[PDB]
Amino acid sequence: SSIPGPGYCMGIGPLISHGRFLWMGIGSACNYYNRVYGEFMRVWISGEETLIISKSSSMFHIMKHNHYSSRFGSKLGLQCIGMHEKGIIFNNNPELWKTTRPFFMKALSGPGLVRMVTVCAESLKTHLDRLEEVTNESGYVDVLTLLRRVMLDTSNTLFLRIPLDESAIVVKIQGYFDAWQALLIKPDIFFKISWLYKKYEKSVKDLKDAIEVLIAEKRRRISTEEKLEECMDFATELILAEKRGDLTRENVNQCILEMLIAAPDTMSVSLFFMLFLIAKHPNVEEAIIKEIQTVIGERDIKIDDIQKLKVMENFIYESMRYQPVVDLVMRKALEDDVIDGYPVKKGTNIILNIGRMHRLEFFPKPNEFTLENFAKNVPYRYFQPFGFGPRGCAGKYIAMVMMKAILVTLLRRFHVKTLQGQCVESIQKIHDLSLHPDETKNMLEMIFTPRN
Ligand code: HEM
Ligand SMILES: CC#CCO[C@@H]1C[C@@H]2[C@H](CC[C@]3(C)C(=O)CC[C@@H]23)[C@@]2(C)C=CC(=O)C=C12
């Protein structure tokens, strides 16, 4: 069929398009190029050719097959934040990624997902008898920060369990993301002129140095053991594998960082959106509270319960569909293939625009937020909010729990209000790596007026 896209104006194309991404934001550039051209088209980030697809069929083909299990980005930028052949999130070494994913995959399922539902509860309760830490004089709560802390506290108690200063680590995790996001696709010229990224180089060191202190104490606590396999958290599983010879110490320290930042990074921003959604849809928030009484009463939340919270389940899915945080997935082709009649050479970067695809395909009322879109059991081949196949979200299951749980325990106890005219749509957003609130603008606060 040959590939839709802008002109390769003899080396001018690649410069305008890359340049567009840097000015626009990886997020919006895709939403732009999809709109103007096809729902499948070619652009250039650095030299390398790169597809951007919002066709459900292409999307599904990609995430399904094993020869797409790699992402992409500046080898200089990934090296700088420490994810260059080290993490899993952006680990592009297919063998070295292959042997690391199992560790995440194990810790984020089975007994840990059972532990989580209650670890999430107790770790949110603690912080809700502590609003003094987050609340304005005028009653305004700093929802974002609150969430990040309970998210990081949750991640700690499950995967690492070593005493730390939430307050301080959160600000650092932010700096790390800020940097990661800044450097993911900066062209190499950028890295020569060094006084131009020293900020980002210092935000990385901050978090890394703060965590090397944490893993150092975690190592002591295993070398003086109360009989080993009694308490096998993610962090240990790794350290024990290192002291076999499967992982580099360096490689371990990244997974433990990548395992910590993940939830605060994304769950906080996601739940925050769902909160401006519950606060502007009274019809919905009533359905949820009733469902919570029907199923739980004022008992504690337990694993057996989560399947029953069906209306909330549809709320999370509809909030993620209508107002996503992770709206695009970056993959890369490893073997050549034809996909939807188009040829795609190995080495071709891919950006799946799942955020646009959730408005162009399947759904009945795509452009309005309604629990109506999920009244008819969604095929999952038309709604991929986590991804799937050999490189889907590793947290994809645990997350669905944690949201359910922290949404329950919150709504269970507070009515939520949005300062003045504000709402998800009127909120000002940055559309770069993710799709998150612009934190330098204000009016992002909420008001937690009690209940019953
Ligand atoms: C609801 C919030 C979340 C959303 C929307 C989300 C979404 C995603 C998406 C779309 C991907 C890319 C998968 C693909 O390429 O198809 C991803 C990757 C990943 N996610 Fe999440 N995720 C969420 C929560 C979490 C949580 C709570 C964790 C663990 C703390 C987590 C851990 C990971 C990891 C480790 C990867 C990289 C997997 C790999 O490339 O090998 N995620 N996530
Ligand atoms: C604030 C905020 C936020 C959430 O988005 C980021 C970036 C995610 C990335 C997975 C791979 C993803 C989906 C990609 O392939 C491109 C963007 C990537 C994701 C979701 C995973 C963990 C994390 O800490 C941070 C993120």
Q: Which residues line ligand 1 (CB under 6 A)?
A: 63, 88-89, 101, 104, 108, 262-263, 266-267, 270, 325-326, 329, 385-387, 391-395, 398-399
What CA dihedral angle connects 170, 172, 174 and 180, to 10 degrees? Answer: -140
- 71 alpha carbon, distance to own chain's centre: 15
∠ CA 324-41-7, nearest 5°, is: 130
By C-alpha distance, which of 163, 166, 165 is closest to 150? 166
Q: Quick one: DSSP state of residue 312?
A: H
Domain residue extents for the chain: 1-452
> What is the C-alpha to C-alpha distance for residues 365 and 359, in angstroms, rounded to an integer?
9
Residue whose entry in the numeric block shows the structure tokens 């939807």:
340
- Do residues 191 and 307 touch, judged by C-beta distance below 8 A? no
> Given strand 140-141, what is the order of strands in its sheet?
140-141, 446-450, 414-418
Query: Hey, is 174 helix, strand or coil?
Result: helix
> What is the C-alpha to C-alpha distance for residues 335 and 348, in angstroms, rounded to an integer?
10
Where residue 51 falls (left for φ over 0; alpha for ψ -120 to 50; beta otherwise) is: beta
CA end-to-end span of the chain: 62
The annotation status of 120 as a binding-site residue, yes or no, is: no
The closest-lying atom of ligand 1 relative to the alpha carbon of residue 259 is 30
Which CATH number among 1.10.10.10, 1.20.1250.20, 3.40.50.360, 1.10.630.10 corresponds to the domain 1-452? 1.10.630.10
User: Which residue has the CA at smallest separation from atom 32 of ligand 1?
Assistant: 395
Give distance in angstroms: CA of 403 to centre of ligand 2: 17
By C-alpha distance, which of 420, 410, 425, 383 is closest to 277? 425
> In the PDB record, what is the listed experimental method?
X-ray
By C-alpha distance, which of 19, 78, 71 is closest to 43? 19
Residue whose entry in the numeric block shows the structure tokens 């609340």:
135
| Burial group, residue 312, by CB count within 10 angstroms (0-12, 13-18, 19+) | buried
Distances (CA, A) of 174 to 19, 72, 181, 236: 25, 22, 10, 25
- Residue to probe by mutation, ligand 1, list 65, 100, 386, most atoms within 8 Å of CB: 386
Residue whose entry in the numeric block shows the structure tokens 């999370």:
316
Cβ-based neighbour number of residue 72 at 10 Å: 23
> What is the C-alpha to C-alpha distance for residues 243 and 336, in angstroms, rounded to an integer?
38
The closest-lying atom of ligand 1 relative to the alpha carbon of residue 104 is 35
- Residue to probe by mutation, ligand 2, list 148, 265, 384, 398, most atoms within 8 Å of CB: 265
Give distance in angstroms: CA of 93 to centre of ligand 2: 18
- Do residues 347 and 332 touch, judged by C-beta distance below 8 A? yes
> What is the C-alpha to C-alpha distance for residues 74 and 392, in angstroms, rounded to an integer?
22
- Do residues 378 and 317 touch, judged by C-beta distance below 8 A? yes
Close Cβ partners of 75 (under 8 Å, ≥ 6 residues apart): 84
> What is the C-alpha to C-alpha distance for residues 301 and 307, in angstroms, rounded to an integer?
12
The annotation status of 330 as a binding-site residue, yes or no, is: yes
Q: Quick one: DSSP state of residue 280?
A: T
User: Which residue has the CA at smallest separation from atom 11 of ligand 1?
Assistant: 393
Give distance in angstroms: CA of 260 to centre of ligand 2: 13
∠ CA 29-34-39, nearest 5°, is: 150
Q: Quick one: DSSP state of residue 158?
A: I
Which stretches of 75-165 are DSSP H helices? 75-81, 94-98, 101-107, 111-128, 143-155
By C-alpha distance, which of 236, 202, 241, 200 is closest to 217? 236
By C-alpha distance, which of 377, 373, 395, 378 is closest to 386? 395
Sign of CA dihedral 71, 344, 324, 383: negative
By C-alpha distance, which of 9, 52, 263 is closest to 152? 263
By C-alpha distance, which of 166, 404, 374, 92 is closest to 267? 404
- 83 alpha carbon, distance to own chain's centre: 16
Close Cβ partners of 307 (under 8 Å, ≥ 6 residues apart): none
User: Which residue has the CA at smallest separation from atom 40 of ligand 1?
Assistant: 89
User: Which residue has the CA at smallest separation from atom 14 of ligand 2?
Assistant: 329
Sign of CA dihedral 392, 395, 397, 400: negative
Quickly list DSSP for 33-52. HHHHS-SEEEEESSSSEEEE
By C-alpha distance, which of 62, 117, 99, 87 is closest to 335? 62
Resolution (A): 3.5
Close Cβ partners of 391 (under 8 Å, ≥ 6 residues apart): 63, 68, 69, 70, 101, 331
- Which residues pair with residue 225 across a beta bridge? none
What CA dihedral angle connects 47, 49, 52 and 53, to 10 degrees? Answer: -170
Q: Which ligand is nearest to the CA of 113?
A: 1
Q: Quick one: DSSP state of residue 1?
A: -
Give distance in angstroms: CA of 388 to centre of ligand 2: 15
Give distance in angstroms: CA of 307 to centre of ligand 1: 21
The annotation status of 265 as a binding-site residue, yes or no, is: yes
- Do residues 39 and 361 touch, judged by C-beta distance below 8 A? no
User: Which residue has the CA at smallest separation from atom 22 of ligand 2?
Assistant: 262
∠ CA 130-135-137, nearest 5°, is: 130
> What is the C-alpha to C-alpha distance for residues 75 and 406, in angstroms, rounded to an integer?
37
Give distance in angstroms: CA of 392 to centre of ligand 1: 7
For 332, phi and psi rounded to 5 degrees? -155, 145
Cβ-based neighbour number of residue 85 at 10 Å: 17
Give distance in angstroms: CA of 231 to centre of ligand 1: 25
Residue whose entry in the numeric block shows the structure tokens 């199992």:
102
Distances (CA, A) of 349 to 10, 52, 91, 329: 21, 9, 15, 11
